[PDB]
Amino acid sequence: ASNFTQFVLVDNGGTGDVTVAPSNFANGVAEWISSNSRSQAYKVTCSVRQSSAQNRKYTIKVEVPKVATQTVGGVELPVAAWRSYLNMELTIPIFATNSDCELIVKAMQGLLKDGNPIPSAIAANSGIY
Amino acid sequence: ASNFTQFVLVDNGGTGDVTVAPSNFANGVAEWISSNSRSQAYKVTCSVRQSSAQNRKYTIKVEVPKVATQTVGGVELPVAAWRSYLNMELTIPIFATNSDCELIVKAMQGLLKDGNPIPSAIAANSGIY
Amino acid sequence: ASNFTQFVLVDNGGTGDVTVAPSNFANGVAEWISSNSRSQAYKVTCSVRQSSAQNRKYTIKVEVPKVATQTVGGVELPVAAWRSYLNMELTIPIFATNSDCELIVKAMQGLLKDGNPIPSAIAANSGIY
Amino acid sequence: ASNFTQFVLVDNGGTGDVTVAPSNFANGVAEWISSNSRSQAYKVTCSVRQSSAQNRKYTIKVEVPKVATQTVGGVELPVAAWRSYLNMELTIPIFATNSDCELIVKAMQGLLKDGNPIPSAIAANSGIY
Amino acid sequence: ASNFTQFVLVDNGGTGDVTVAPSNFANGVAEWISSNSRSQAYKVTCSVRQSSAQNRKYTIKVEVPKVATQTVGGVELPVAAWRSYLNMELTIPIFATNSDCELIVKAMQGLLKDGNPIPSAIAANSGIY
Amino acid sequence: ASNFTQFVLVDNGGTGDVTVAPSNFANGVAEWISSNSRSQAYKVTCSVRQSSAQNRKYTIKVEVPKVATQTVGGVELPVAAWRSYLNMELTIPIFATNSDCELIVKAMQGLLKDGNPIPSAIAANSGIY
RNA sequence: UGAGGAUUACCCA
RNA sequence: AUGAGGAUUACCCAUG
RNA sequence: UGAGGAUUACCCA
RNA sequence: AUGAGGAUUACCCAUG
Secondary structure (H helix, E strand, O other): OOOOOOEEEEOOOOOOOEEEEEEEOHHHOEEEEOOOOOOOOOEEEEEEEOOOOOEEEEEEEEEEEOOOOOOOOOOOOOHHHOEEEEEEEEEEEOOOOHHHHHHHHHHHHHHHOOOOHHHHHHHOOOOOO | OOOOOOEEEEOOOOOOOEEEEEEEOHHHOEEEEOOOOOOOOOEEEEEEEOOOOOEEEEEEEEEEEEEEEEEEOOEEEEEEEEEEEEEEEEEEEOOOOHHHHHHHHHHHHHHOOOOOHHHHHHHOOOOOO | OOOOOOEEEEOOOOOOOEEEEEEEEEOOEEEEEOOOOHHHOOEEEEEEEOOOOOEEEEEEEEEEEEEEEEEEOOEEEEEEEEEEEEEEEEEEEOOOOHHHHHHHHHHHHHHOOOOOHHHHHHOOOOOOO | OOOOOOEEEEOOOOOOOEEEEEEEEEOOEEEEEOOOOHHHOOEEEEEEEOOOOOEEEEEEEEEEEEEEEEEEOOEEEEEEEEEEEEEEEEEEEOOOOHHHHHHHHHHHHHHOOOOOHHHHHHOOOOOOO | OOOOOOEEEEOOOOOOOEEEEEEEOHHHOEEEEOOOOOOOOOEEEEEEEOOOOOEEEEEEEEEEEOOOOOOOOOOOOOHHHOEEEEEEEEEEEOOOOHHHHHHHHHHHHHHHOOOOHHHHHHHOOOOOO | OOOOOOEEEEOOOOOOOEEEEEEEOHHHOEEEEOOOOOOOOOEEEEEEEOOOOOEEEEEEEEEEEEEEEEEEOOEEEEEEEEEEEEEEEEEEEOOOOHHHHHHHHHHHHHHOOOOOHHHHHHHOOOOOO
């Protein structure tokens, strides 16, 4: 393998897709950023570590820019009004096989699948009702 | 509408799919569990809160069990050998438009798409490299 | 989806039926109240909690009022002359599957079925003899 | 005459019905037990008492076992893997006529009727949502 | 019933009406928001509780955006310069019947009716004179 | 002009309408009461204040009485069995245009329009669900 | 009294 | 609030 | 826990 | 100032 490659983070059907490419690997923490200023960039980082004697833990972080009314290349303050932050922690017990691990990935894909409750509440600036 | 509906968490292609259904909304924490004894059920929980004057924060948790039958005191009980835990927090500024929010949802879907770096590392009990 | 909806508490043919509607769901306690004066209303509350490591516990309460008019100093108010109070607690181990739970529900319905010892003693101001 | 008789606690069509038979009526507590091993039996108890000057109070208890075989040292015994415990207390003022009592009984039957919020939450390992 | 539905908050005679739709139901507090960023959204929340032994209390809150010179989807600070807040508390004694309650609703509709003093002072950036 | 005029608080369609008239302006609190003994009168009060350097705040109160005749000391007095209280505060930024203010007034009128969720819940002694 | 626990007519505050 | 802090996972830790 | 009470999500042992 | 704090409703509470 060698999975440290460029990938499409936001699929817009070929036109205006957001691709994210390897940009840093300091300390085993892989980073991928889009082609923008770091203030307006799409950013992804990932790392695995053994949290305790029984678990391994993946920490994945995603930063997404506020695009509506954005001035490309501009200085937009406050930083917090223009960015969203995703932080995921996946704890997997050392007994989990590749097959167990494949199922965990499907559970994550199913959760965020289009039309499902969670992605629909988020996309609509809503909660559950 | 009511976005509090059941969905399939693990799509095993129509056969052996894991579907999760609404099971509790006490304390503003939406919960969904699979049709199992509570000791073996998959579980999804979600809540949103205005974490600050200018952010809203979603807290999402998924528990994937490894089911087993355990003999306790000579008697057999439906149990989970172990559980894998996904904990995610998403902070979105209040200035984010619905289309800004849809962008976050798509980035999360792309991040986990089959074949992309992260879901590949996880499924192979590997790190990024 | 929701099970926090209105339902018929007292079925009197299709007329004189007492319906109880959702009213409040604060702190994990769901409350249903019948219409008109809160003073002469029926009330149902329900809550679930993990009572211990292996148990989940339901607490249900029902109040049946004796509707009456109070006259004091010539001022009459709608009141409940008195009220019966039902309180029930149901403990279910986390090992109970959906089938086990359905059986528990049938046992509760059979206990109170018309003609059986218990609903008969109560409906007649009686005990067991 | 007697209301201390056997009755169907769990109606499973006309086969697999759990019947509970009188067993003991000591100290004002009537007890009903299903047949076969006392260890795997269903149990119902009921008692009435004048709780105060104006009230009479019923205390009803039901136990639904999870039938299982225990094997220890090669010696197997019929046991209940676990048990659900229902406990209910019903307070009725001495002013309640037979009509008032019949209404109280219908309110209890309606609460647990199939399809209503409460029996539905329990039968599905759920709470209110 | 089931009154948790979408409704027209600002009636502009069909063209450019502001509709507000269910968006959250965490803790029994119903929320409805318009289709906008949460910073520019029309928001309505409502909840009932028994404040004391004699009263029930409805708490209704409304947030209305400053629309003149607004930049749709933009980041507009300070938040307080761009939003109006309405907070209503309605205390109703437990003796009030549906009919008493209908009259209270008319009293509220009459107060805010067009051409009446209060709505005319507000709409004119005025007080009473 | 002088917006301090009488209006009909409860429009019972020309017959039995409750009209309220200016009755006091002491201390900057505009008051309106119905033609009744002060013990049975409906009452509306309103005041505006620059609550901060950048806001103005309107405080509005409505009292709806439930009238009755009470025999105190063998003598009959016109009285109110109870009163329902509406307390509302509206904070508007100083930057709000007159058309911004008209938008607030319309949102308040739509909120309470017949058939909409909130006025429906109140009139039926119900919550939102 | 307790949306207090339970090995369920026990036990706790 | 922050942590590539921990968990038995709607809990705990530390810092601030 | 309680065949403990209650103005019933309170209170008592 | 904030409170889905209370009221007997132009008063009271709590926090800050």
